[PDB]
Ligand binder design. Sequence first.
Ligand SMILES: [Ca+2]
Ligand SMILES: [Ca+2]
Ligand SMILES: [Ca+2]
Ligand SMILES: [Ca+2]
Ligand SMILES: [Ho]
Ligand SMILES: [Ho]
Lengths: 242, 242
Amino acid sequence: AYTTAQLVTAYTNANLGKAPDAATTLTLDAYATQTQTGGLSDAAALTNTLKLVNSTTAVAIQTYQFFTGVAPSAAGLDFLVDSTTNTNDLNDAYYSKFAQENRFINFSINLATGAGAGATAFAAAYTGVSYAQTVATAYDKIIGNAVATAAGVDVAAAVAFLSRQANIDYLTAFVRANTPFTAAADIDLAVKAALIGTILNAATVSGIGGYATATAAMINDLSDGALSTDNAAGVNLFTAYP
Amino acid sequence: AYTTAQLVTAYTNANLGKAPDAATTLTLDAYATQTQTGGLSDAAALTNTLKLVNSTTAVAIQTYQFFTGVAPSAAGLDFLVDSTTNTNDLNDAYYSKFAQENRFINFSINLATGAGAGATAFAAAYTGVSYAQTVATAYDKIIGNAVATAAGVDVAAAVAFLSRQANIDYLTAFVRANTPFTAAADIDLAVKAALIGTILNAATVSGIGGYATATAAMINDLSDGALSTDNAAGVNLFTAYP
Ligand SMILES: [Ca+2]
Ligand SMILES: [Ca+2]
Ligand SMILES: [Ca+2]
Ligand SMILES: [Ca+2]
Ligand SMILES: [Ho]
Ligand SMILES: [Ho]
């Protein structure tokens, strides 16, 4: 049985020192009183609390891992999510009009195609490969292929959907309008980055797959105030949380 | 098998020393003779007896808990329900023309928006949140969300109903006419209080949910004359009756 004052501290540390909105406080409060009456177990309540930190935090853990091969350190996460120094950060003013999806896409393009940390590596790996393959391989990397089928979701129907011509056209226009790219190669390259972003979203929302399960465990460890692993130059998810 | 003289004592202590009306005596009598013939079990008869004390007592236990975080002590309950000192009390002359519903609404507005004990806390918690969210979160706090679905009642249909525009308009007029509030903020705040009141009624009438089940157990303990928990400065329902 959690006091409503414990669930807010668990939420605050997950959000890296951002105190919850008035609205969400009421949501947390419901989860507390549903544990005092035994209409909800303890572990269940805590998971739902940490589910609310998806947009702010999970966006920074997941994308960094996929592109640079390592999740940011606790100190680094602070900078990306909730800081004094970064004027514009994930739980700040700039981003308050981006949905969950457009947050993932934003982070992806940044890290991948710009002067970002992942640019040189992602540029060499995904050159001269088709949209179809980009999606298929990435789907398997993130969500697994075996795991998805066991979970009951049909892989073939999902991959086809993401790579249909209508989808590609939508992104092409999106990337052309928003990003300062004009070259034919860089636009192509950025579209791929946006697709992988879309997949990361689709992963974290369903809870299936390796990426989603590890990120959940990192946020759980981060909940209590102190991150156990906390290597100075980044934590590799798959090493630390088996 | 209960003698009709035992069911009246069980009713009297639940009502805190108010002896039942002529009409209800006849109802209790039926419940007695239905236990002597074995057309009704013992526990069943006693529950129905205590179901009749809903309007008078359950109104004071439930509302106090929701707004001040603690049900009133036995001594306090006496004051609210059936006393010499309080000229106007729940089972007295003032309230004899209020239905069950309007009793809940009355108590809510008192405790929440006035100079009542809950004013300062409720004022800070429910400021700058919409009608929709007020209802949704409160529904879950009181009735549970998981519990309701298992019980078979569809949550979405019920919450939508409570927050439909027609409902809000009815209350707005109601609050404006009855309460001495003229400010635009206080009226807004009082409407929310009235909604939560409506939900408390809807809870106690169906028997579903954490709030309703605990209040039933407190009344059962109060039935025999002596309240076991009886902390001087209030009994927290969810601690005392697991
Ligand atoms: Ca900032
Ligand atoms: Ca930890
Ligand atoms: Ca009196
Ligand atoms: Ca007792
Ligand atoms: Ho922070
Ligand atoms: Ho009394």
